[PDB]
Design a protein around this ligand. Structure first.
Ligand SMILES: C=CC1=C(C)/C(=C/c2[nH]c(/C=C3N=C(/C=C4\NC(=O)C(C)=C4C=C)C(C)=C\3CCC(=O)O)c(CCC(=O)O)c2C)NC1=O
Length: 243
């Protein structure tokens, strides 16, 4: 979790570096245990006919979080990516924390973050709604509309092109705020009924199936590793459907 040994970190976009550090700091003092990705994946690289893609993976678990996945990637020299999801244990009914930053030579092109619902009514639990509303509406100059598969995201979802350093920092601070709310709610969550656990499991399955429709991720993976590898990676490593 200490990113001091990361090969990629020193070379990544500064907003990605700050967000990676914030996520790792959020996790550092939790009751962590390792989570073994398929084939005990850590670092991987690939190339076909174009640029090489390099990926670093860290993954943990706690009693409240089934799988806490932080991934850093770089395609060639330009394109830097941070991907993070905390997949909840359905027993506790917590939402899904996720974020993705994509950056190039010209700066950050996409910054997305959310606490995504798992309830059948598509709403965050009441305590989250309350705490999130109290943060206020953040202002960003260049909002982006989610694609249709993004119906999975809550009304608090951020999806922007940051306009300047102030907005980069405002976005990272809001992600820190989401993490602080999420970690707090994890300590007050009670184990739920079997019917409720089942409901939350279904919401998490749906979230993964929709995230797998994102061709932006798929094309990056395919250009470096090919179709079969990308399908395995998206369905088994990034967005595994629990069952
Ligand atoms: C191997 C990892 C990985 C790769 C290769 C990746 C690539 C990637 N994600 C993208 C968009 C995006 N990514 C997301 C969202 C997310 N994506 C996530 O994996 C998570 C957890 C969320 C949200 C919490 C959305 C909503 C878009 C825009 C999709 C589009 O414009 O159609 C883009 C386009 C950026 C842009 O338009 O400016 C790329 C290249 N994202 C990844 O995470």
């Amino acid at each position: 979790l200490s990113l001091t040994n990361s090969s990629l970190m020193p070379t990544l976009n500064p907003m990605i570096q700050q967000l990676a550090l914030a996520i790792a700091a959020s996790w550092q003092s939790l009751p962590l245990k390792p989570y073994q990705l398929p084939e005990d994946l850590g670092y991987v690289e690939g190339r076909l006919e174009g640029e090489k893609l390099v990926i670093e993976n860290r993954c943990y678990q706690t009693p409240q979080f089934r799988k806490m996945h932080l991934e850093l990637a770089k395609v060639g020299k330009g394109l830097d990516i941070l991907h993070c999801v905390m997949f909840p244990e359905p027993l506790y009914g917590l939402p899904l924390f996720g974020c993705n930053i994509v950056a190039g030579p010209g700066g950050v092109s996409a910054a997305i973050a959310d606490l995504s619902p798992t309830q059948s009514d598509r709403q965050l639990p009441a305590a989250y709604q309350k705490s999130l509303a109290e943060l206020g509406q953040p202002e960003f100059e260049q909002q982006r509309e989610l694609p249709p598969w993004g119906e999975i995201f809550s009304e608090y979802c951020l999806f922007i092109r940051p306009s300047n350093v102030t907005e980069e920092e405002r976005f990272v601070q809001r992600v820190v705020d989401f993490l602080q709310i999420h970690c707090h709610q994890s300590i007050v969550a009670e184990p739920l009924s079997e019917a409720q656990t089942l409901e939350h499991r279904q919401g998490q399955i749906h979230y993964c199936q929709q995230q797998q429709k994102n061709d932006k991720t798929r094309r990056v993976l395919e250009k470096a590793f090919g179709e079969a590898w990308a399908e395995r990676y998206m369905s088994q490593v990034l967005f595994d459907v629990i069952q």
